[PDB]
């Protein structure tokens with residue numbers, strides 16, 4: 001089988017295994033801080049450098065994957081804690097949208113909220129223009145921030161959140177298990193057929209954004225990943 | 233919400249938080265050895281003492297859970313490596329079947345392979361009588377060892393295997409990710425309605441068995457678990 | 465050429481191929497537990513029974529060797545995790561020091577920390593009396609536990625650690641590669657002239673010790689070894 | 697820390713993690729055949745796609761690495777079993793030398809036998825022009841196929857050879873351990889300062905060449921690699 005696996009316990013600048021796009025900045029403690037607090041409509045994304053081949057056109061096979069990661073959102077004085085983080089999968093040629101307004105677009109879509117990606121968001125601001133739930137929420141997105149499905153959640157400031165995601169090639173199910181600092185778990189699942197939504201090779205990464213009045217610290221702390229494609 | 237969570241990094245006898253059934257024994261290193269290598273048709277089961285309320289007849293809600301465990305199977309000289317380990321969920325009054333032949337029944341079913349339980353099996357022997365796959369395999373079982381669904385796998389002697397299981401109340405999906413010692417991952421998923429197959433209160437646990445000529449070391453090294461039931 | 469090679473994927477009692485000295489005990493899962501958790505100043509050592517000719521007096525030649533093994537140290541409640549395991553080479557007539565205090569001596573030296581051996585230590589406790597570094601470490605020992613050279617390391621409870629050793633006769637260089645469970649590698653290398661420090665025939669083996677209040681589970685799980693001495 | 701690791705138990709076409717250069721072809725059994733048996737001065741190289749950061753100009757640190765791999769060379773009728781395989785490390789922009797004559801250049805150097813790389817060769821043909829020992833041999837090359845150091849070896853046709861390499865950043869020691877199918881080991885070592893001979897970012901891989909009358913099957917079967925750079 002064809003397996004891809006990596007494990008970051010801390011990050012550093014100048015590491016060929018990662019692509020930094022936009023306002024991303026590596027902190028002295030090894031954390032990745034996605035957006036710049038002093039910039040309007042700041043967008044910062046981090047991608048794993050090597051493109052992963054999630055499905056084969058010759059075998060028609062799709063990959064299964066297990067990935068776990070932890071992040072932290074923290075309030076800054078005077079600004080609204082917005083907009084949130086998003087773990088996504090997108091074509092290898094993926095780039096931050098031209099003229100991106102950041103904000104509720106999460107750094108991955110256009111003004112209408114359309115884009116070419118699939119991912120799980122942790123939304124801390126309800127954008128009525130994208131049909132956001134009235135509360136913080138975790139969501140599954142397929143080519144749009146107007147979530148296919150969402151589950152009510154609570155973003156605690158300065159709280160380390162651990163997430164685990166499982167994609168099963170057979171059922172084409174994408175499972176997510178979020179563990180809040182207080183101990184409670186929030187799970188959400190949905191059948192998304194990657195073979196039909198994304199090309200053969202893609203790139204995994206995280207993104208975050210802010211607006212003029214919406215800014216908060218968005219931190220990625222660790223990230224392990226393992227995918228396996230049946231080659232036969 | 234109503235959450236239940238424990239984490240065993242090592243086990244010990246006389247700990248009131250665990251039930252020992254059958255030939256189970258706790259090794260000096262803190263591991264739990266499920267079967268007795270000297271006994272014919274040995275069956276051993278370890279259960280978390282406190283029953284967990286997976287669903288409510290009052291609210292009709294079903295809980296969601298995240299659990300992670302690791303095990304190790306090892307070959308012993310002269311005997312065939314059989315039969316396997318099974319992570320199961322069963323009524324609080326669950327006991328090893330009367331007159332259990334061990335072997336292909338993994339300690340949870342009768343001779344015909346029927347019983348009242350739901351779980352993930354790691355089968356190292358093909359029992360044609362239970363329509364077993366021709367290879368080692370992981371499988372989802374619902375009230376029988378004639379698996380509802382299986383996926384080819386490979387048991388590596390002396391290799392420490394890691395399992396992540398997530399159950400999403402909403403979509404009733406049970407997702408399993410198995411990370412082999414060589415790095416490769418194996419995922420299997422299936423929709424199972426706990427509310428219709430199991431009572432409000434259940435017990436989580438592990439069970440392994442052997443026959444006369446089928447014996448091997450079945451070890452449980454660690455196990456963390458968290459379930460949350462929405463109470464409203 | 466003259467080559468000696470063996471491979472233990474699991475051990476057993478009553479195997480004339482191995483020497484058990486002290487509190488050693490072979491677990492039902494085949495692992496070797498070096499110390500007794502209930503004894504004060506427990507010392508346990510295991511040696512490969514047949515002596516290996518590491519150098520010829522006639523030809524002046526020294527043998528090269530490649531050896532690989534895996535262990536596991538696990539904490540036990542109420543006691544400090546000590547003292548560590550040491551892979552050693554010693555005279556065929558080697559035995560545990562008379563009146564051994566266990567502890568910092570690692571079962572291979574006297575109270576001053578002096579003995580006849582060459583080895584690699586995985587020290588989990590800082591013994592000032594032997595100039596131990598302030599943290600966990602891997603060290604190279606030539607006739608003393610006051611390491612010739614050390615490198616910071618981290619012992620993780622219940623984690624299986626793999627180690628690779630290569631000794632090249634020409635450069636008299638002993639290189640060590642430790643693979644922690646988290647993925648990272650810790651290497652350390654040193655020039656040690658075996659011909660001048662040890663006799664023509666030696667015995668390879670492991671050893672671990674504890675004191676009154678310092679005890680932990682020390683396990684050896686597997687061991688492959690090969691050496692070749694040019695005979696011409 | 698900064699760790700990079702991968703594990704290839706078999707290879708496959710169209711895999712984004714590998715760069716194929718020259719006459720490389722992936723066989724149905726998942727083996728890589730480096731040279732074309734019907735081509736004069738055939739050359740084939742296969743590299744890991746992601747460039748690895750071996751040292752940091754900011755910290756002045758060098759990484760350490762453990763790598764294990766197996767290969768097989770086989771004789772084809774009428775042609776001389778030539779020329780051998782070489783595991784090398786070169787600058788990320790590395791390519792097959794223009795007008796490479798194959799043969800004793802091993803695909804990594806010009807006609808004079810010079811180039812920019814470091815590596816371990818398994819040379820099956822004595823090229824006087826490069827001061828080749830009169831027998832088959834394993835050697836350490838630093839910017840030239842005129843080995844800095846060699847050790848006599850024997851290449852058995854159709855035999856699967858295992859090789860283990862370790863590089864300790866501290867001593868700057870590159871140690872190799874070769875295991876012949878017959879059981880005997882061949883070790884070789886040498887202090888090479890990578891920080892001085894190679895740039896910050898390099899790519900690892902294997903190369904193989906042949907001439908008009910020198911041809912044989914060069915197969916790569918597996919390859920595991922792990923390197924760690926202290927980031928602080």
Ligand SMILES: CC(=O)N[C@@H]1[C@@H](O[C@@H]2O[C@H](CO)[C@H](O)[C@H](O)[C@H]2O)[C@@H](O)[C@@H](CO)O[C@H]1O
Pocket residue numbers: 080082083101102103104105125127210211212213214215
């Ligand atoms: C489209 C736009 O950028 N509007 C600005 C406001 O943006 C929203 O801000 C919230 C937080 O209040 C959140 O980040 C949301 O996604 C944004 O669309 C906000 O920045 C406001 C403060 O003056 O200015 C608006 O123009």
Ligand SMILES: CC(=O)N[C@@H]1[C@@H](O[C@@H]2O[C@H](CO)[C@H](O)[C@H](O)[C@H]2O)[C@@H](O)[C@@H](CO)O[C@H]1O
Pocket residue numbers: 312314315333334335336337357359442443444445446447
């Ligand atoms: C029904 C029964 O117990 N039959 C015995 C055999 O049991 C099978 O053994 C395999 C391993 O071969 C495996 O554990 C399977 O589940 C069992 O049904 C086996 O013990 C055999 C050896 O002599 O005796 C049969 O009577």
Ligand SMILES: CC(=O)N[C@@H]1[C@@H](O[C@@H]2O[C@H](CO)[C@H](O)[C@H](O)[C@H]2O)[C@@H](O)[C@@H](CO)O[C@H]1O
Pocket residue numbers: 544546547565566567568569589591674675676677678
């Ligand atoms: C000399 C001696 O044996 N002292 C006892 C202590 O031993 C040290 O203990 C540490 C762990 O705390 C470690 O083993 C070290 O190698 C030993 O020197 C320790 O056992 C202590 C607990 O009460 O009693 C001392 O007297």
Ligand SMILES: CC(=O)N[C@@H]1[C@@H](O[C@@H]2O[C@H](CO)[C@H](O)[C@H](O)[C@H]2O)[C@@H](O)[C@@H](CO)O[C@H]1O
Pocket residue numbers: 776778779797799800801821823906907908909910911
């Ligand atoms: C420089 C060159 O290409 N010479 C040809 C010979 O090449 C050598 O062949 C041996 C095996 O005989 C080996 O590969 C060596 O590295 C090569 O240089 C050889 O092919 C010969 C047969 O007619 O022709 C030469 O010109």
Ligand SMILES: [Ca+2]
Pocket residue numbers: 083104123124125126127132
């Ligand atoms: Ca939003």
Ligand SMILES: [Ca+2]
Pocket residue numbers: 315336355356357358359364
């Ligand atoms: Ca079976």
Ligand SMILES: [Ca+2]
Pocket residue numbers: 547568587588589590591596
């Ligand atoms: Ca010590």
Ligand SMILES: [Ca+2]
Pocket residue numbers: 779800819820821822823828
């Ligand atoms: Ca040559």
Ligand SMILES: [Mn+2]
Pocket residue numbers: 121123132133139145147
């Ligand atoms: Mn949203």
Ligand SMILES: [Mn+2]
Pocket residue numbers: 353355364365369371377379382
């Ligand atoms: Mn089965």
Ligand SMILES: [Mn+2]
Pocket residue numbers: 585587596597601603609611
């Ligand atoms: Mn020490």
Ligand SMILES: [Mn+2]
Pocket residue numbers: 817819828829833835841843
């Ligand atoms: Mn040469």
